[PDB]
Amino acid sequence: TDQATPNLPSRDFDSTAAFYERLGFGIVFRDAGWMILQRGDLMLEFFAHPGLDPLASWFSCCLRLDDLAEFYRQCKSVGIQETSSGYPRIHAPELQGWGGTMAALVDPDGTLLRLIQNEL
Amino acid sequence: TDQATPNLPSRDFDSTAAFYERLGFGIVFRDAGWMILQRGDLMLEFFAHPGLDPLASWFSCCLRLDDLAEFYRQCKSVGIQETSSGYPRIHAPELQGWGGTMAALVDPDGTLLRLIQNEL
Ligand SMILES: [Ca+2]
């Protein structure tokens, strides 16, 4: 099956893996410069980027989810805080101008994951 | 189905849509700041980034393809040059350091799409 995957920066592969592992992602590949995490059909690939400046980062991807509320619930239960300040953090689901609901997760490297509910 | 999609920059949605249309992608959604292109199961999302410098870009994504050969054949056939610098451009499939094969496509905004043959 053809699939397009995001390529996201990681300042430290161990901390990235540990963060996403709490959300159900497992490592399916890892070498000195590349890491792939998977959670069911969700696949994220990370490149080593020790010099990243999170505040100047335009990195982001979308997670289009069949059940956004489950995932969102999961983020809050492992202790990611609902806040506007610092990272990592989450932003609650909000009705968007396009009739759908969307939340946001910001990971330890300041990467924005837009969480979007699939049109059921 | 859950899916993670890349979010890639575009200085001009018209030039982006016209380039990917030659490779079989259609527009699924477009507004002033966001655009979504689709080719079968491949989904790419673009955000407006008029200040981007295509020669200093860190943006990339992977295309993990059931038939890389076919895709690569379509790139050449629409006239994307196989060269070592400048954009857009293509890099021919290369047996990589994992046993698999890989090619590279650089798009009109300097974005690197790594083209990988899936393991059938
Ligand atoms: Ca056209």
From Swiss-Prot, chains A, B:
Coiled coil: none annotated. Residues 1-118 form the VOC domain. GO terms for biological process: response to antibiotic. It comes from the Bacteria. InterPro entries: Bleomycin-R (IPR000335), Glyas_Bleomycin-R_OHBP_Dase (IPR029068), Glyas_Fos-R_dOase_dom (IPR004360), VOC (IPR037523). Pfam families: Glyoxalase. This enzyme is encoded by the kanamycin and neomycin resistance transposon Tn5. Belongs to the bleomycin resistance protein family. Binding protein with a strong affinity to the bleomycin family of antibiotics. Binds to CL990; an antimitotic-antibiotic compound. This is Bleomycin resistance protein. It comes from Klebsiella pneumoniae. The gene is ble.
